[PDB]
Amino acid sequence: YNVFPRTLKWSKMNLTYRIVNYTPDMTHSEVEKAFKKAFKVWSDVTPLNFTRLHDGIADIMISFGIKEHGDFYPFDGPSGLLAHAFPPGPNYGGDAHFDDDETWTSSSKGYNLFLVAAHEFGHSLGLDHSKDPGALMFPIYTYTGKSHFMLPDDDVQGIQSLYGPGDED
Ligand SMILES: NC(=O)[C@H](CCC(=O)O)NC(=O)CCc1ccc(-c2ccc(-c3ccccc3)cc2)cc1
Ligand SMILES: [Ca+2]
Ligand SMILES: [Ca+2]
Ligand SMILES: [Ca+2]
Ligand SMILES: [Zn+2]
Ligand SMILES: [Zn+2]
Question: What's the structural domain count of the chain?
Answer without folding.
Answer: 1
